[PDB]
Amino acid sequence: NRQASEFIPAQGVDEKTLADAAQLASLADETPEGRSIVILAKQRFNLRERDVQSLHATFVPFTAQSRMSGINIDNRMIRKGSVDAIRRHVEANGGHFPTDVDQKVDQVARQGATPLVVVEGSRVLGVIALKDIVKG
């Protein structure tokens, strides 16, 4: 019962950029929430999912244990998942989680939203605040 409502760029990132990466990196996840995000950009930008096999790219399945899904393509890599999840993905690449992005994820949470974090390759492009359909 979770849907993306808004995306916010990381330090120095454009908001359209964050929404776009969350959409294609969610095409590979089979979770209903990954569709919730692909909608978020749809209404905001009115765009369509990107075909991975038309780019000869690859989908990255979403697993709950790491809480992460993404997509790979012949010129880019995208990953999105839990804040702890994305921090571990950046460190494995050898990237770093910018404070500004950690602050956006926390304000997403303190506001009652579930902040997901999205990065390109090993760097965070922005964070996503989701509304919870069901209230705890």
Ligand SMILES: Nc1ncnc2c1ncn2[C@@H]1O[C@H](COP(=O)(O)OP(=O)(O)NP(=O)(O)O)[C@@H](O)[C@H]1O
């Ligand atoms: N399309 C998606 N791609 C990548 N991650 C997602 C996607 N949709 C949801 N997520 C994250 O994956 C989490 C769900 O996986 P899960 O491991 O069951 O977490 P959870 O235990 O239910 N939540 P929490 O208790 O806060 O860790 C969601 O809460 C989101 O933060």
